[model samples]
Target: LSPSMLDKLLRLGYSKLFADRYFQLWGERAIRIAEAMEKPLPRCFRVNTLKISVQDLVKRLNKKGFQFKRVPWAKEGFCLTREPFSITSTPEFLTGLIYIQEASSMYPPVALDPKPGEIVADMAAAPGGKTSYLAQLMRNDGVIYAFDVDENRLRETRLNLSRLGVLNVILFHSSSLHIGELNVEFDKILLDAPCTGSGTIHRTMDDIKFCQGLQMRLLEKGLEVLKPGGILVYSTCSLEPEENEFVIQWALDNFDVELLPLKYGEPALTNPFGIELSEEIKNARRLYPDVHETSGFFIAKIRKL
Candidate 1:
């Protein structure tokens, strides 16, 4: 770690070890990653097609002085080119005609592609962005077992689901590990595991170590309840491989699962921090703040055989 290089990274608001790890993972691109992280994230939201048509919502919001630019990769996703005020304060948002979520966050549900009648599980679901999206994709017709250990976050999920007019999801204020208690198999599962928020860090690590273990456990439980031939999409906002690629690799080694190719974002890191990971790990996708113009994120779609 050169002092000059370390000093430059520190100025961008990252810890010494984070800077060191990123430099090793991204090589010359770490600087650009840091630069993007330092900037304000673009405000993005997914249109709640369950409640309102995208065309009508955009037209209404546009007349109210919000500029809409469709995110290329997400079907109902858009970025506010111009927000006259905080996007959250809008009447449309309060009524849940639109959901103010990060663009990168909308990817996991899309990958899961929960159909209208499939049984789905959203492990670690809270603040219900993906849960609500899953409900929308299912046309609010199927069962979704949305679980979150944090009661407070689950409360928010409940409110979001209600406001979004999602009648299908059965919210559980419990840990994902308890999923076995349900004794039901899901057609699809989304384990959007909690992490140290490494990708969302502008000023954002022992937490990374702590979260990795929990992530692996949650994934194991998620797959355990997934029906044979079902799909499970795992994701995190962390850029670390320990929480991303390594966890997926663990799933591959121990579970009868195969990584499915994702159509969005870059491929997951095959070799992060100088360690050789499964080459199939590349089937997973990695979104960089610099490259995707959103929060750094990772998404891996795994299919049970």
Candidate 2:
């Protein structure tokens, strides 16, 4: 007997609760999202300007028959238009001329806009996708205390950072919640909190609710370490409002942080699941599979008063 669509969705990595919640959130659009998720995501990466220029890198790769399209919103980001083979194995990638990353994942660091002399904290800096980008943006001139709770991931982060020619980051084998122990004030912070990957079955949890609790704690800690007038960009791959807008709403209600608007993707949900969120929450951005051809993602830029 053929399994029903619901069964297939479950097997595709979506939890039943996520399906129920998304059905209410997207209504008829949920099926369209599922269809979009089923396809493989394009290989995306950003040119490592810390090592080479976009013009030079594109010319070098084009000569090898690799095709790419520039990602407009993310400076230096490119999506592979055609893949002749695995991108990770290329001499360019192995030498860190480029860093493999999702197009949407490149946004948080761009939004943070870390400067060359500023001190920045990247909470949960594992595998160092954003950490390496932060280094690039800073021109390898600032101090970045990159932290991760997972030691194994931290190991990879160290490797990636060195391979990518990143010279400014200091790796910590701990969580961002513990950043205060460093007793250093941050000019900027990136809390790309862990989530259910709900936006991505395209990439759950009884992991969902638990992730929210952890995210809230991390947000609180990140804000505490942020200097007055400092920027904190909170982001996630999850599409759930609980993980995105709801968390930002809670921050607005409790802290002196204000939301700064973003330029790409759709605006965040102000009214989700019959609950009214703060009007300012609309400044946050959401990327969808069907619309953006990226993962289901959310980004919120906040400034501490």
Candidate 3:
């Protein structure tokens, strides 16, 4: 860690011994990441097709001095200049012209790449970021069964989807683990599993010193609802190997699924973890904030064979 980092950690009440140990393990990389974390998070937006075409939206944003670049893996991804505007209050946002989302958060649906008419599920889709993206990717042509246990948050998901004029999503205010009772097989399933939120430490300073073993239980439940030959994408916003690779490995060791290879797009901004590409996690993509210029995230795509 840099001297500045050590100073910051000390200020945060970390003991000298702990600071030294952290510096020894993470080194300059940790310093660099800490510095990056201090800056306002890089902004990202997805064009809302219900309001305008991507080309038109890009042209308008360019006219407004908002420079952006397309994300190679996602058709609607555009990195934008960080500014201090309440995106939700903007007319564009009010009209569903765009969606403010972290770039890494946009990858799950793209990896799933659900087709126009396929039935898909966004398991644990509260607040509906990935769920809305999946609806958009399907061009509003398919059914998206969005499940969440929290009613209040599910309302937020409903509102966001409504604002986007998303017509293909069905909101389920129930436990994601109970989705099997729906008795309907889908063409694709996305499990943006609940995790320790370790990947989000850059944005918040909350003390998350506990581990939840419930994630594995949720993963197993997600698998039960997926159909043979269907695609399932499991993702989390956590960097801990226990919450990510280990859970994926559990699925592989217990199921008849094939891990699919992932194709990297941009090298400058993408760092994937758990790349051993085991039978269960072959199509997985891990995003590291220090390397990806975005919040940390993990994604895995599997085919139930």
Candidate 1, 226-299: lDDT as tens digits = 99999999999988888899999889999999988888888888878778989999899988989888777899
- Residue lDDT tens for model 3, 163-273: 899999998888777888999887898887543365665312223223335667777777777888998887787655566666777678888887676664211112123
Tell me the spans in candidate 3 whose CA falls farther than 4 Å from its real position. 1-31, 82-89, 194-196, 202-212, 265-283
Compose the digit string of candidate 2's lDDT tens values, residues 1-305: 12365566566666677666777787767767877866777899899999999999999898888999988688699999988888888899989999988888889899999999999999864637888898999999989998777888888778888888999999887767789999999999988854337766632555767788888998999999999999999999887788788899999999999998889988899889889998898899988889788878899999999
Candidate no. 2 TM-score: 0.92
Q: lDDT (0-100) at residue 19 of candidate 1? A: 84
Global CA lDDT computed for model 1: 0.86
Q: What are the lDDT scores of the predictions, listed in order?
A: 0.86, 0.85, 0.71
Q: How many steric overlaps does candidate 1 have?
A: 0
Quote each prediction's TM-score: 0.93, 0.92, 0.81
Ranked by lDDT, the better of candidates 1 and 2 is 1
Model 1 scores a TM of 0.93
RMSD to truth, every model: 2.0, 2.9, 4.5
Q: Which candidate number maximizes TM-score? A: 1
For residue 279, model 3's alpha carbon misses the true position, in angstroms, by: 8.6
Model 3 Cα RMSD, 1 decimal: 4.5
